[PDB]
Design a protein around this ligand. Structure first.
Ligand SMILES: O=C(CCCCCCc1ccccc1)c1nnc(-c2ccccn2)o1
Ligand SMILES: O=C(CCCCCCc1ccccc1)c1nnc(-c2ccccn2)o1
Ligand SMILES: CCCCCCCCCCCCO
Ligand SMILES: [Cl-]
Ligand SMILES: [Cl-]
Ligand SMILES: [Cl-]
Ligand SMILES: [F-]
Ligand SMILES: [F-]
Lengths: 546, 545
């Protein structure tokens, strides 16, 4: 019953292997012609400096491209983050618009960004051997801005996961520690950028998928408001689900790179190619503002107990912000359990998971997905019964289960209205404290491979802002200390259910791993969100190369 | 029983009566203090000039307010367009922010715009005696811009109608001809502005409700992209339906008034009050552009046969645009029947009408709603049965019935995806022809009272653009001639079903009534849409500029 799936995996692995061999050949050829090039100097240039040298002609696009291609090939050896080499990029390299804001910049793409002539498998057998007819809109815009998309990077099967394995290309590993997850679903991006193999990448995010891998791999990422950028041509598993919007956004080694990428994407090219996106230009004056901020903050969401490292990261950032003249205001969005258990879960699974499950018919189920598939497949009556039985002992598990049941269109309208009202509730709460931005913990350090799928509760920090559709980004601010790690041994969680128990084991042995915080602003305020992220970066990593 | 509904109607009529009496008292008081004021001259000033004189101090806010209030009271006698006088407006009058872009401008509000202390009944007994506890966001913004919202205007019961009667406040009449509908659901606004009793109003639109009353009453109206303006605080019958977007927008005597209103609303106040609205400022340079346009056009949607007056309006406008140097290109959105019958109907009635019907429990059903409520109440299995029977001879009726059935969330996702793909498909057509804007017929002339409810097919010209969620506005360009009207005797419709039969009769006896065209641009291009409307208005009715 898996002959088709086995065939798909065999071919996918052949293509991946052939891609990597092609990259290696091209790199060797370039190095042989350019033996004196200082590759290390080039790779360590911050993106903004790299862009400046490309624009001035101090570095050639060829030098930058083949040097990054070599590094990407090398870091892939230990991470398995690359699924495909975007072959025609060497021609794009030659024709990159000279005055483009990203002229000559190699860019990595999550596998779901459609690219002409390439599959977007999402790790699913049913999508193998179905090459895209054309580049998606954001890829078109990247190219019009002179960038050179060069690889597709790995995702967990279906993308519905914050780990990163599928049965076609296998498992992506965290470059900091091979036993750890790079996070997900933009996990290949996190591993590649996090190890220096790409200066800039695009990911997508519906429950944290830009923010998890950025945090786990020690890089920066921004999830804009859902409709700030075009989703035209993004390959997905479920279509027409609009209660919880998908978002796409940049990942990079610093905040300034995110801002440049957003600025480059928010151009007339994008707005003309996809008229459904509001034509809101990047407001430079907001991004570059240096006014003191009113910063809401919380040390915990009272849902996922923060690791000791997460809490310390949050408190230290709060303290540095206060020392820098900002006003820090205790603030926690109301009714988080509702937002997660009813609104988010219900929005994602209004149909009981039937549409999602069609993708898995005849396919293997990657171990990183845990019991998700088995649970979604349960009859609605059984989900309900099991929920009732679990409720007295494990209310959180019971709540998720009950809200993953199929329902009528009538009930979906009701849910959609509740989502709208909840958004207005939190906005009103925010305005009552006159906040500018909000600082929150971000899940970390990286969990062991194959554990995100058994720690669903831990999406609480990120998924809240998908439900609310507020821009949210993450910035690395510290690393796990011996003390942080020792204190983790005493971690209990608020619920004591299997999700709390797994998280504790999954974060074992994390000394030295990166830990982030999350920065949030109101809908459409990506510029202000990035301004705040820049502040955090300046205060918590003061030696970060300009 | 009906004692609940009767009681609500009694109370509503008493409140309306008391409002009008309060207006009368205020107007007479003011007039006695200002016997020399040239009220006719004030009432006939185009809004832009009225605003200039208010801003300079040449006209006082009081003179403008009470003069319009008097006109509104007078025109209401023959139209019954006013449901409530927004009593506290005389206090807003004295506190209007002096540098506001609408300083001193009286503004009328469709009844669904929540206004503190007043009902938004929607003509439904269940909402009577339930006053709003805060102004809706756009009303707050109007006030912050110095405008003076002064009346709530009538809507058809539930607003799901392009006529304008409900059992609480009764029936609104077209000011051009008392036997005619003023259109709807923003019909009170249409009648009030159309008769000179307000220089600017706000309406809402999910299947044409800004555009029908504007066209039927001979005024201008714009339905923006759904999320260009804040819908916070708008009272409705159904919530959480997002497949077919609700929009709100201005209605006024000329295009410049719509542009001023949009410019005033699209300000920091709005964007801060409702962060969910993208903070897109009004792009003055786009609105003011005089560059030649590539204008797609169609003279019929092949779904609703246009009236002779509609077709002449379209052709004459096309010809004037050509003479003015614009490029006119035939264009028709693909699969219109699918967009209307499957996507629009399905989106509006995904739950079989159950949520909507709850509003009518224990209430009279206004005759202007025709058989809608009777039909919606039928069991899904029966809607399906009747659909099969009707299909051979009357495919249009069968299709509507079939697509008004309840369905699962799974099916609604599928439908929502189809709406997204359809929107991109029309965008792709538009781009392939390199269009700037699109010119279409607009339903007209006004239908006889109580007929819109029995001519559902005729929403085709407008509903398409709610489905697509493109900005669309209407501009009056001509009036029905006796020649046009006599030609209605040759009108057959494309289907010959009951909707065509009703529409034929309903559009007769319309000599002298206004007829519009519709102007469309891509999502978020309200300024371009307005630039085009301004062009049409200038070419067809130069005296308005
Ligand atoms: O689905 C996800 C992320 C899932 C993150 C974990 C959710 C875990 C969870 C949440 C609620 C209930 C149960 C499990 C996703 N990330 N990216 C995409 C995506 C989808 C379509 C096109 C492009 N990207 O989808
Ligand atoms: O419902 C409508 C207009 C309905 C116009 C006639 C539709 C006729 C039709 C269409 C498709 C199938 C059956 C009948 C409406 N107009 N304004 C509103 C409205 C709704 C909520 C808040 C504010 N305004 O709603
Ligand atoms: C739905 C927004 C408009 C509501 C108009 C009627 C308000 C009655 C009082 C409501 C108080 C808050 O629930
Ligand atoms: Cl491929
Ligand atoms: Cl939007
Ligand atoms: Cl009928
Ligand atoms: F996600
Ligand atoms: F409407």
């Amino acid at each position: 019953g898996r002959q088709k799936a086995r065939g798909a995996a065999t071919r996918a692995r052949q293509k991946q292997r052939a891609s990597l061999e092609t990259m290696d050949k091209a790199v060797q050829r370039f190095r042989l012609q350019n033996p004196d090039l200082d590759s290390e100097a080039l790779l360590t240039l911050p993106l903004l400096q790299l862009v400046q040298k490309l624009q001035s002609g101090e570095l050639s696009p060829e030098a930058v491209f083949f040097t990054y291609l070599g590094k990407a090939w090398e870091v892939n050896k230990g991470t398995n983050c690359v699924t495909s080499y975007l072959t025609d990029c060497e021609t794009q390299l030659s024709q990159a618009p000279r005055q483009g804001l990203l002229y000559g910049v190699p860019v990595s793409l999550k596998e779901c960004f459609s690219y002409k002539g390439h599959d977007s498998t999402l790790g699913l057998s049913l999508n193998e051997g179905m090459p895209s007819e054309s580049d998606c809109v954001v890829v078109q815009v990247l190219k019009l801005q002179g960038a050179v998309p060069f690889v597709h990077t790995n995702v967990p099967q279906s993308m519905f996961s914050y780990d990163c394995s599928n049965p076609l290309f296998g498992q992506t590993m965290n470059p900091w520690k091979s036993s750890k997850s790079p996070g997900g679903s933009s996990g290949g991006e996190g591993a590649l950028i996090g190890s220096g193999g790409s200066p800039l990448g695009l990911g997508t995010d519906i429950g944290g998928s830009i923010r998890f891998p950025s945090a786990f791999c020690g890089i920066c990422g921004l999830k804009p408001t859902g409709n700030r950028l075009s989703k035209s041509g993004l390959k997905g598993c479920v279509y027409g689900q609009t209660a919880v919007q998908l978002s796409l956004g940049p990942m990079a080694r610093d905040v300034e790179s995110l801002a440049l990428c957003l600025k480059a994407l928010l151009c007339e090219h994008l707005f003309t190619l996809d008229p459904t996106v509001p034509p809101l230009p990047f407001r430079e004056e907001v991004y570059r503002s240096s006014r003191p901020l009113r910063v809401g903050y919380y040390e915990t969401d009272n849902y996922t107990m923060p690791s000791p490292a997460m809490r310390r990261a949050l408190i230290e950032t709060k303290q540095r912000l206060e020392a820098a003249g900002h006003t820090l205001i205790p603030f926690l969005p109301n009714n988080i359990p509702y937002a997660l258990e009813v609104l988010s879960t219900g929005g994602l699974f209004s149909d009981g998971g039937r549409s999602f499950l069609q993708n898995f018919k005849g396919d293997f189920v990657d171990p990183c997905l845990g019991d998700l598939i088995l649970i979604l497949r349960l009859p609605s009556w059984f989900k309900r019964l099991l929920s009732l039985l679990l409720k007295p002992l494990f209310p959180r598990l019971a709540a998720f289960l009950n809200n993953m049941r199929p329902r009528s269109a009538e009930k979906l309208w009701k849910l959609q209205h509740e989502i709208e009202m909840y958004r207005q509730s939190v906005i009103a709460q925010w305005k009552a404290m006159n906040l500018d931005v909000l600082l929150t913990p971000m899940l970390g350090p990286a969990l062991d491979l194959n554990t995100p799928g058994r720690a669903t509760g831990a999406v609480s920090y990120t998924m809240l802002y998908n439900c609310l559709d507020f821009p949210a980004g993450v910035v690395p601010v510290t690393t796990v200390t011996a003390e942080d790690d020792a204190q983790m041994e005493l971690y209990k969680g608020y619920f004591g259910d299997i999700w709390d128990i797994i998280l504790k084991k999954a974060m074992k042995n994390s000394v030295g791993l990166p830990v982030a915080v999350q920065c949030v602003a109101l809908p459409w305020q990506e510029e202000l969100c990035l301004r705040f992220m820049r502040e955090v970066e300046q205060l918590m990593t003061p030696q970060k190369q300009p």
